[PDB]
Amino acid sequence: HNPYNFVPALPRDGITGDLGDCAPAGHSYYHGDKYSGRIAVKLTTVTPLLIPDASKEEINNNHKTYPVRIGKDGKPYLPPTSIKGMLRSAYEAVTNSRLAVFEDHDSRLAYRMP
RNA sequence: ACUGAAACUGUAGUAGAACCAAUCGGGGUCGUCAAUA
DSSP states (O other), rough: OOOOOOOOOOTTTTTGGGOOOOOOSSSOOTTSSSOOOOOOOOOOOSSOOBOOOOGGOEEEEEEEOOOOOOOOTTSSSOOHHHHHHHHHHHHHHHHTTOOSOOOOOOOOOOOOOO
């Protein structure tokens, strides 16, 4: 298997309700019908997790060696941004939202003739 | 065919009240490139 695949981003014209485009609930108050609060999550690794600290990357002959990123207690500092981006991309998939990061992609790509 | 004199433009008054330097973003990952014989 190729180590990547894709999740189809179905078009979303005519999608309605909470999966549609909607005005945001907002932050001004806790809405009577809408949930707020704390979710506690356990994350456990199944395969090893790379958390490279690019601030401490060391280079020889243009090759970069990364240590693990560690916190003020010397345990691995898994960034919440890295969790959030995993979670968001997973969320965007199963919810089929707009794709949050689409770069320009506005030039025609190129290929070579046989 | 005799200059008026003398008299503080001063006294009171907080450039201040309200306002989040903030919103979004996995330190990530695969096949291209060259054109002829």
